[model samples]
Target: MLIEPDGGKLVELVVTDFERDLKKGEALSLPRIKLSRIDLEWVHVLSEGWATPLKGFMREAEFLQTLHFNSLRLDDGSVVNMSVPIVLAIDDAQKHRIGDNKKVALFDSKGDPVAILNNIEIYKHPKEERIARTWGTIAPGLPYVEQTITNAGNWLIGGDLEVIEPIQYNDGLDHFRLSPTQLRAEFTRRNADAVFAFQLRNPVHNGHALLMTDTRKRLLEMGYKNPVLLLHPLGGYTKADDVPLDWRMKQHEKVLEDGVLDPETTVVSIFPSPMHYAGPTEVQWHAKARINAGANFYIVGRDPAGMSHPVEKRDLYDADHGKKVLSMAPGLERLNILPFRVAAYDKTQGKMAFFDPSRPQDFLFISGTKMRTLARNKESPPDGFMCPGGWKVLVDYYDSLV
Candidate 1:
């Protein structure tokens, strides 16, 4: 549904607009948010984990801290954070997808391809180096994550970057990864009235987009007027950035540009944290963070936050299982849960549809990995990854890697 004809330029334009007018808290049309509540003030403080794992990687360490503060952005309009694990995962994922000549294709309503890729890899758009070069100037007690990590482990959790999982070297490595603050800030600044938050970690394909659209409409239908859309990519660890950083940002920008969102009603941004591929527990973590950031409503897909654990792939949960698990979290029982059935496309129905094994034409799955192979192998992407014009930009970006 998000189609960008110009590809990368629109994102560049949006970033310029963001930088020119709304770069800082004081520059906004809204009053600077002063935390009067003690709980909210404490919420701003986040702890860092081990350091030895990232000893010489001071650039990364400093950058991770910036992410904690929501102060990093790459040139192509991406916010950089401590996503070493995400990059490492991509390395492994790329090898796996490429070696086997495998592809993870995502289709759309009409079984049309939206976006495609090899494997998902993560990258901080505003490189940490750029942020460090300008860090002290951006926000001042700032970079607090440094102290947290130094006091704790004095290093990042180091392991093969290709693998996605709980790190052996550090504790709470997944929790500490920053980026939510940026999302929170955007939500606060753009839609001050938002009380309900809709968080999705997966890429914005048609089905995911439909979930967001339907969720928002449903909330309104129920008399909930203030709702926010928080699309936080698990940058820390995901299948990989099968689609590159610039392209990912572009894809999102396309969503914004298409008028799909009522800017006054919705806010979307990258969630700098990476995916652990850890299923249920990770789902709980995501729900809690959304609530902490002021979300009264959350959406979780089937399997919500999941990982392979190297086991033969099995569904992480029954259809709408993510919604069921959220209620299990303590204190989360009161929040609204909109569990979505697996969303896919039906070739025979000629439109976007939900996942149903009974409908063979509707059950094809989309994945970032499969999309990459289509481009690399000079093949067309499946419907799930379909976007009017964004895929070519993605493929062109990948061609540079060739």
Candidate 2:
């Protein structure tokens, strides 16, 4: 059997059939809280148990627990890892509009009803503390902090949710988006009990596939008969320069088609979490999401979720702190932390290989800047750095830019 989802079972808050119809009609009468795009996306995730055990937006207790402890203590006293606070923020006028109401209808910014939140609890958001604590700095230009304090309101609202319908992006990439239930079912169908998840936001490279195949080998070496690789790519809002999901998906598809990764042992899916750039704390959320998707092990790389200091011209958080935190995080003890070893191009082997201290001279160093330069100039990457088809996709994307 696969590992248990967060809080013992995945949470499903979307009402169905008769109840759904009733809630849909009822939502029209409650106070409407227009949700932002990201908030609406979160509603769909919360309803499907992707963000498991969060029945609705976080209340004061749960908010503080997540903000400070990077976890939530469930009713059964079991703490589950959760670094991101899923609180819905509102304004003063909206707060007074909610008044003493116990329910509110959540609408999209475009005035479409998406879900209904019940047992509403309004509280001050403590924005300053949230930025200082979770992020450890009030430094301007911090991505999430800027959006949290400016784009969103100052007051927070929490309640149990009942989504009117599953949110659809119509981006033609929805098929890759699977609920936690669906993903767990796939893992079970494959008869995989030991699954390792590698999360990425960029296009698939030779070393990316090598790490996955190597991880599967390590699992087999440890006595697993059929270890599976969850090749999960982040499909949410990313920075301006991050590879778009569509092209990345195409590049990923090419990797599998080229036999670079074993299709039978790999399951590709989209992880719809926006980039937080919160360094160590954000990496916890990254690993925790995989647990809900039936992954027992999470692959963490150096500076997971880390970004450069906006002004200091240096790294914001320690490079290795993310993996270190995941190894010791309270609610994440069940999920095995796989510290990623450096993968480089082997000059002698003409393929990607893990860095070996014994043969440092055999590996060729290729920086991302160099790779982009090659792609933009229509020059192929050093042999075996990426499969031809996937390299074409990357080169085409960069070509399309200029």
Candidate 3:
């Protein structure tokens, strides 16, 4: 049987078409609360059940619980994993203006009304505490945290969201933004009993493709019939220097178009959480969201969200802690963790293969940074490293920066 969504069923909170039209008119007259682009992306995520078991922004009690314990105690006293607090925070002035209001308009950067938070429960944000807990440092160069720590609101408002218009960037890749309910239905239609989700932010290349296919092959040998691959990429706010979602989406499509991933066995969708760089704590949320999407297994490679100390230039967390914490992380016991084995260029065979420790000298260390450097210089790695089309997409993206 497929794993049920957290809280037994998926939670979708977007208002119906008829109600949206009704609320569209009402939204203009109410007090408005502006959200950053990342916050709006989360609105799209939360309204669509990606953050299942959570119907809206977190209140103080749940926020504190999620901060200290990477899980949420549901209404039934059952705990479900939740690593990040999804909050709609407002400044003190805005808070004073919004005092005692039941509903407030939410506007995104697109200059249009996005959604309304119904029955908001405003509370202190505790910014420093959340920052220190999730990020483990208030250091700079991890740009997102700097933005939040210096500029974000000091108060949080929680409620059930009624979206008048769903958040869409109109970036020509909206087709990949399938909701959890829709994805679950598609999985049912595909007759897949066991689904493995592989989440990534990097461009797909020969190595990543091989890792995914290899995972399915292993599952098949273990007597699972028709296991499906969910090639989910983080499609929300990333650091300014990382590849943007639009380019990354095309890079992924390039590999799929070349048959790197089989059309029938694989499903590609965007996982809409902004990158946290939270390492061990973040992987819990990473795995938890897949469970909500009906995945039975999740692929997490080394240092799932690892980041070096901005000033010290050394790794912030232990290399293996993310997977170790995830294995026993409360409420994540069900989703199988495929501590993904990475592939390297096997010098003896001239193709990307998993490292054979018996002959370590035969495997070439062509790291992701190596590929990024090659792509930046308008160069290519050796022939078998990536599909031609995918390589071209990467080159073109880097060239555009010039």
Candidate 4:
């Protein structure tokens, strides 16, 4: 089963020999590795520390064990069955052969679904060795990699199920903590005065391209060397199911062929990170990760990777929310987080404009979710909705899904 690792106290026991020693005849299903925290601090720490009860203290079981808080509640005010497997593996018959694209249900030990497993890595992370060693120190004597496969099964009972929508398969390019060698190489190659990295989740649209062009122009006008465009596309969780991996790569290749990307200015590729719909916290995480990946300047738009805040009644997704969250992020100063207005086309004004003030009474916005649903029905969005070429690539690819 594909699982995006959630680092917190919950995963404190993953990498130990305990997982391997669960049972002698247990099937050794290989797992893709993702890290959450290291030694009670965030995973990005540069120094190593004494590994002791820190992981154990952070553990949810141990946390709850201390508090004895066994009570659990569902969203609809129902008492959830903690005894059941957190994930209800209804598709057990199709288990092994299930494509990496299929979502795996997540179950807590008592058989409650905590979340869904999004995707698996078809390609190995380029820095696997570093990842292994880095995690090893924290997981030193960890017990068996505890999984809920045997627990969350056989029960035909159903509770709540959210369709695990397919997300873009980023072939390890969108977000990464690059190795020192790679970081050095990127800076040395650019040799520019300032670097402005534009973050995206799909193909370059005309508006995005125009933004890159204009940003460079603005940089030159400010008496600085033309800023380089790092067209970093996210192959991680996107609202739209998106074109398949190889096809998306080819579409990007076609964009490069079209000469929209200036060879002298823009460097483009996939980002390697999982989707964190963790709202404002995600923005901080994204900025920190990009800086670790060698970016000096980052472009963040409205509601970057945000979801509704359950507690805060009026904390709607906003860039101010992101700014508030980033201030607490561990590495905020390492990279300049440039919050920009979401850009959309203006129909009445007949031009692209900032979505903040320019959003009029009749202003039209093409949402990725709306686009995906429209794709399933063979409908085309209005002309000024999305970037012409970018929308064409998406719409044309959606047609092929038929």
- Using Cα atoms with residue i matched to residue i, what is each candidate's TM-score against the true structure? 0.51, 0.94, 0.94, 0.52
Which residue pairs come into collision in candidate 3?
none
The reply for model 2, stretches above 4 Å from the true place, is 346-350, 356-369
Please write out the lDDT profile of model 2 over residues 160-204, one tens digit for every residue: 988888777888988999878888889889899699999888788
User: lDDT tens string, model 1, 1-402?
Assistant: 111111111110012333333332222222111211111111111211111122211244344543343223434554322222211112333344334322222222333222122222223334334323322122222222222211222222111111111112133233423333344455556654445454554435667777777887887787755666665554332343445434565665666565554555665544434343334544655665455444566777776664332333544334454566566654356556777777776666544577677757545665766666777888865644355455556667668777
Q: 1 or 2: which has the higher TM-score?
A: 2
Displacement of the residue 247 alpha carbon in candidate 3, Å: 1.6
lDDT of each: 0.42, 0.84, 0.83, 0.43
- Candidates 1 and 4 compared: the better one by TM-score is 4
Give one digit per residue, the lDDT tens place, for model 3 in 272-361: 888888889888988888898889988877678887788887887887888899999989898888886557788789898887889999
**TM-score, cand. 4:** 0.52
Q: Which residue runs does candidate 3 get wrong by more than 4 Å?
A: 356-362, 367-369, 376-378
TM-score of 2: 0.94
